């Protein structure tokens, strides 16, 4: 099961395309909102092509299913109340996809790509625990939901790896900063040839979208920062 | 038909055993349970409308007579958190969920608080009791505790971060909003 875009940022009035392909032999799809506060609202259901079922939805939230069982929902006239991650499923049992994020805002002078640092391990830490962790710092960024994973010699690391649930307010009264630590053996991190890099996926505006102002177009990107093992 | 979840927090130590609740208002010919993992992805656990499931050490019962259904995790571990829905049934009903998290058993506890370059302080190795509290001062910025395991050392730890760009800001007064431990080693 499958979605595009992962995310989308948009503006009052504007129109969003969500698109789904379910799980190959499925016919039925659904389409579920999850906004921060609810939980899960059923908003659509289509089989064989059709619609079968809405929930609490206006007529400018519409779709359709095609002659494959893929599907696409078109939400018009957005609204701010429209933000919410909306879901996919397939098929008895319900598969679901990875959901599309949906955020409607007044305008995109707030879209900021984060910065990212790492910092090493302390030298202290090292003597007294024989391990190192590295930190790595996601800063200045609106909006959130970023996806911040860790690469070590090319490849992507889960074991040793500790990341903040919820960004932090830079001004709690406004733009996010995010955390996450990686934790080796010191033996790892003083052999030189080791590569560490945390990365940064930040969602923001894409072609579509109209930027004016003087910085740079704030596009999704992948803003990443590096570390060597010791020289 | 009302979804009815419990409960609606779960704190538990690893190696704990626990059990969700879901009750319905009505009949129904399908119940799932699912977890949502941190970037918004739904993982089917069970489908399960009525009898018992096993799938390693999560386990499911739905006594469909009597309109209920009990997620069991037996030796919960920090890789269990997160969100737990349970939903009845051509569309789902969800429940609002079971928040679960699972901290460490930190029998080797080392509280110490270090400086990083390339600033930044971390505040590691303290036990799952320890609460990491935010700063007062909105240009100081600290993290929540969270769980690291460094699988092939079968070894977990906790770790909160801060930093500033304060003069003033410095490790040794960084986490002082917080009850520290008294041995903390600060290098
Ligand atoms: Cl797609
Ligand atoms: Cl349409
Ligand atoms: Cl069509
Ligand atoms: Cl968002
Ligand atoms: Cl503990
Ligand atoms: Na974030």
């Known amino acids: 099961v499958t979605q595009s875009p992962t995310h989308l940022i948009k503006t009052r009035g504007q129109q969003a395309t969500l698109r789904c392909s379910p799980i190959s032999g499925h016919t039925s799809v659904y389409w579920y909102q999850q906004a921060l506060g609810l939980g899960l609202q059923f908003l659509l259901w289509?089989?064989?092509?059709?619609?079968?079922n809405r929930g609490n939805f206006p007529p400018r939230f519409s779709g359709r299913q095609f002659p494959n069982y893929s599907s696409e929902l078109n939400v018009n006239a957005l609204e701010l109340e429209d933000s919410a991650l909306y879901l996919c499923?397939?098929?008895?049992?319900?598969?679901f996809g990875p959901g599309t994020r949906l955020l409607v805002l007044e305008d995109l002078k707030n879209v900021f790509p984060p910065e990212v640092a790492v910092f090493e391990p302390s030298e202290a830490e090292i003597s007294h625990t024989q391990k190192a962790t590295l930190v790595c710092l996601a800063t200045g960024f609106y909006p959130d939901h970023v996806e911040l994973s860790w690469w070590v010699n090319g490849k992507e690391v889960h074991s040793g790896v500790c990341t903040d649930p919820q960004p932090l307010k830079e001004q709690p009264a406004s733009r996010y900063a995010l955390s996450s630590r990686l934790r080796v053996s010191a033996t790892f991190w003083q052999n030189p040839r080791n590569h560490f890099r945390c990365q940064v996926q930040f969602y923001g505006l894409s072609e579509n979208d109209e930027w004016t102002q003087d910085r740079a177009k704030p596009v999704t990107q992948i803003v990443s920062a590096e570390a060597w093992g010791r020289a | 038909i009302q979804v009815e979840q419990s409960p609606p927090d779960l704190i538990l130590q690893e190696g704990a055993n626990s059990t969700l609740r879901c009750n319905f208002s009505?009949?129904?010919?399908?119940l799932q349970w699912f977890h949502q993992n941190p970037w918004g992805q739904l993982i089917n656990l069970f489908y399960?409308?009525?009898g018992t499931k096993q799938n390693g050490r999560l386990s499911a019962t739905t006594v469909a007579t009597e309109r209920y259904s009990l997620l069991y995790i037996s030796s919960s571990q920090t890789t269990d958190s997160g969100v737990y829905f349970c939903?009845?049934?051509?569309?789902?009903?969800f429940g609002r969920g079971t928040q679960l998290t699972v901290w460490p058993d930190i029998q080797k506890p080392d509280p110490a608080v270090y400086q990083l370059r390339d600033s930044v302080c971390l505040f590691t190795d303290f036990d799952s009791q320890t609460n990491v509290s935010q700063s007062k001062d909105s240009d100081v910025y600290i993290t929540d505790k969270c769980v690291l395991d460094m699988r092939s050392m079968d070894f977990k730890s906790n770790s909160a971060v801060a930093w500033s760009n304060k003069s003033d800001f410095a490790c040794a007064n960084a986490f002082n909003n917080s009850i520290i431990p008294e041995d903390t080693f600060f290098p």
């Open positions: 499923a397939s098929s008895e049992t319900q598969y």
């Open positions: 009505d009949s129904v010919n399908n």
């Open positions: 939903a009845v049934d051509g569309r789902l009903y």
């Open positions: 399960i409308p009525s």
């Open positions: 289509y089989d064989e092509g059709e619609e079968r």
